[PDB]
Structures are given as C-alpha cells and as structure tokens.
Amino acid sequence: XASXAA
Ligand SMILES: [Cu+2]
C-alpha cells in the first residue's frame, strides 16, 4: 504494498 512496484 500500500505504501511500498516491480
Ligand atoms: Cu507497493
């Protein structure tokens, strides 16, 4: 994740 894409 909510506060963390790959
Ligand atoms: Cu994320």
Side-chain angles (χ1 to χ4, degrees):
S3 186

